[PDB]
Paper text:
The protein [name] (encoded by the [name] gene [C1_08500C_A]) plays a crucial role in the survival, pathogenicity, and antifungal drug susceptibilities of [name]. First, [name] has enolase activity and plays an essential role in glycolysis (catalyzing the conversion of 2-phospho-d-glycerate [2-PG] to phosphoenolpyruvate) in [name], as knocking out the [name] gene renders [name] inviable on media with glucose as the sole carbon source. Second, [name] has transglutaminase activity and an ability to bind host plasminogen (PLG) and thus plays a key role in the invasion and virulence of [name]. Enolase is a dimeric enzyme and is critical for glycolysis, where it catalyzes the conversion of 2-PG to phosphoenolpyruvate.
The diffraction data show that in an asymmetric unit, four [name] proteins form two dimers. Two CaEno1 molecules form a homodimer face-to-face in an antiparallel manner. Interestingly the β4 to β13 strand forms a large β-barrel, while the α helices of the C-terminal domain are wrapped in the β-barrel to form a mixed α/β-barrel. This structure is similar to the three-dimensional structure of [name] in other species, suggesting that the active site of CaEno1 may also be in the C-terminal domain. The 2Fo-Fc electron density map of 2-PG and the key amino acid residues were contoured at 1.0 σ (gray) (right).
Residue numbers in the entry:
A (entry chain A): 2 to 440
B (entry chain B): 2 to 39, 44 to 440
The structure:
């Protein structure tokens, strides 16, 4: 099976900004993939190509990226007649057209849609589900399929919501149940309880949501957020069954070698900005005070010494996830493994730009004993690729939003479909999320 | 082409509540539909088990599809292209006047999925199959004006603002693509202005993707929208629509525009005529092109009087008035209460009945605005429905949250597919079905 037609268009993401959609046609039909887009994007991410025409979409058009697909990538790839099942060859071909380390000739947002749609087409060519094709090409361990713990960002801050809260994501992780369906039900019940409690304490507007569907109360401290979530877990009836995770996204508030926990205040007092050591101490206290099982981007994207020190302190007690640190990039992951800076990778296909490189990132992580959490971006779409990716890679953990806003539920609903299809051939990762690939 | 397998499951809607999804398999493949969620409505069946989803499970509706509808329909071997026969069969199976045995949520999923299978059986897009079975005027397809709910009040905001929905309608351009782009730009400008004026928190979004700052008066809301249109660079090109949802503040035959204040002075509540005056003033000061539920759901005389006043200058839309209900619709047409209907397919429960309600409206010279629900999904059926029915109007949210954008994105795909065989309804949205 090879591409007969490849056509790109722009569509609107969940924030109302344009992004790239690719239609990849073979003998088996038309396969569509849509590229997501971040807000708190790491400086080391592959290039997201935007038009910069201030008169259209506030400079956020993707007409140039779409044209790169239609006029450069499409005719070259179609001429090549590459078997879509050979994902590595598809991706090698796409990388050859760009020839830059950060995909800055064509744009990662031109390349990725083609890479992902090829994988969908390949699944169809073999008459297998996408998650099985991914398990094949990633060399996942053979046995039961592992369904991921849904890490649900139920309270949004940082760059994803207006208000004072600096830390980006406060997540629940329903690890203390035996099935994915139960975990999603519990997440939805805790979330609804949280919405009710948030409106009662902070007013109706606090129950409106951030970019990823979490409630967005205007609060200044992590303690206030965590206390709210603990109350929701308790009032929903699931005390002791629900872990908490954070994405600090600390690069967003790293200034003058320090960390501003009031960074959205134009008049933030710089005498109150924390050093690396001061911020590390705050985490150690929170990890003791709350059932926090995972912290992501606790220090800035190149603040290696701070990660290394913190890992020495608490790496055996919690999952420590690289996101902006690692940017789903094997070269950065190598450095992080050598330095002992983290013990898990946040896997974002659009940080690196091809499925093959994303899978290499995952396998490099697994080889080092790391966990992998497959992730959405804050600018998401109706695309559901990451659901199948999370299952195929046997990650045992996915981050794809609060159980609100359908760019989030679309992924969670797809896992429900996968769970039903597999029946007893699947197990839910549950408490084993961190080492799920080995199960 | 007939059903070889029909299977339902629950999935989660855009508010995190369960809803029904149907997989309908034929020789052409698997076709999926998902049902949305919000005495005159078809009834959605919920489980009421307070220990699961706070009583909002749809296990019973799902079981009705799997154990009752699927085997009966599969046995009957009905050609899916014959939507009317499919829906007649489904209605016969239930037999109740409001679909309360099997549930409207069980019935609609099968009805919509069958339509998708039927399009595939004929090798045509869903919007074309809908055009065919609805007997839409032959000629160019009409792409709808997106009525985009950018700013919320009423029960959706903590301020005094009594009116429920403020929408933009980018009518002053020649293409759907340009309309949607302008809508996105105006929305982003509105968000920015809202955060500046009311604080960063006021930028966080409601169920349909709009913002809900603490606003005091309709004038304050409309001035904010006008400022966003102007700052975005599209002065004169963008209409405004309102959903007043006036039943929410109708008390003792009067209209309390400060209904969220428990000490609202009843001597300041507006009479029907005073509220009509207010609307007339707003229509003269702002480019308001449509008002939904300007008067309460059974305050018929008020609608009739208001229609005689301004029915020739603006669209007047029934929602609570009409409830996608054939008899309420008849009454409204006979009384001359309004000139447009909100079409909510899940309020009536089959595609055939939805199309009948649209055609009854068109026959009376009414407009039809195809509508989302508050609880939406990644399903895009209503995009193809708005195009196939030649409605010229769709209400499917702000340009934020993908249960809203998925519909608008589908229209982009339809637009590209059609090229010169499509026209944008633009300023002609009211009578688009006759364009
Ligand atoms: O930092 C993050 O983990 C992401 C995903 O939630 O947000 P964004 O896509 O804006 O980077
Ligand atoms: Mg980020
Ligand atoms: Mg992150
Ligand atoms: Mg209404």
């Amino acid at each position: 099976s090879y591409a007969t037609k490849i056509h790109a268009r722009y569509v609107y993401d969940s924030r109302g900004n344009p992004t790239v959609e690719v239609d990849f046609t073979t003998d088996k039909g038309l396969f569509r993939s849509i590229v997501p887009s971040g807000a708190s994007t790491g400086v080391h991410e592959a290039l997201e190509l935007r038009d910069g025409d201030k008169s259209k979409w506030l400079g956020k058009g993707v007409l140039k990226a779409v044209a790169n697909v239609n006029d450069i990538i499409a005719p070259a790839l179609i001429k090549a007649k590459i078997d879509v099942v050979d994902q590595a060859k598809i991706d090698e071909f796409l990388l050859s057209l760009d020839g830059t380390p950060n995909k800055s000739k064509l744009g990662a947002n031109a390349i990725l849609g083609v890479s992902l749609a090829a994988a969908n087409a390949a699944a169809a060519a073999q008459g297998i589900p996408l998650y099985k094709h991914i398990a094949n090409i990633s060399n996942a361990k053979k046995g039961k399929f592992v369904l991921p713990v849904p890490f649900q960002n139920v309270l949004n801050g940082g760059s994803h919501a207006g208000g004072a809260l600096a830390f980006q994501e406060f997540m629940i992780a329903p690890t203390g149940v035996s099935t994915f369906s139960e975990a999603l039900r519990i997440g939805s019940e805790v979330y609804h309880n949280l919405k009710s409690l948030t409106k009662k304490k902070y007013g109706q507007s606090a129950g409106n949501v951030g970019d990823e569907g979490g409630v967005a109360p205007d609060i200044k401290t992590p303690k206030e957020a965590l206390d709210l979530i603990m109350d929701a877990i308790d009032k929903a009836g699931y005390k002791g069954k629900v872990g908490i995770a954070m994405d600090v996204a600390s690069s967003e508030f790293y200034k003058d070698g320090k960390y501003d926990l009031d960074f959205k205040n134009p008049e933030s007092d710089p005498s109150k900005w924390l050093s690396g050591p001061q911020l590390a101490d705050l985490y150690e206290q929170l990890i003791s005070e709350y059932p926090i099982v995972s912290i992501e981007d606790p220090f800035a994207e190149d603040d290696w010494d701070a990660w290394v020190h913190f890992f020495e302190r608490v790496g055996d007690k919690i999952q420590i996830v690289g996101d902006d640190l690692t940017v789903t990039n094997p070269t950065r992951i190598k450095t992080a493994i050598e330095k002992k800076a983290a013990n898990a990778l946040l896997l974002k296909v659009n940080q690196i730009g091809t499925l093959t490189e994303s899978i290499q990132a995952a396998n490099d992580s697994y080889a080092a004993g790391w966990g992998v959490m497959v992730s959405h971006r804050s600018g998401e779409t109706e695309d559901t690729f990451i659901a199948d990716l999370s299952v195929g890679l046997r990650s045992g953990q996915i981050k794809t939003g609060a159980p609100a806003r359908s760019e989030r539920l679309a992924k969670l609903n797809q896992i429900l479909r996968i769970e039903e299809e597999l029946g007893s051939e699947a197990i839910y990762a549950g408490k084993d999320f961190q080492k799920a690939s080995q199960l």
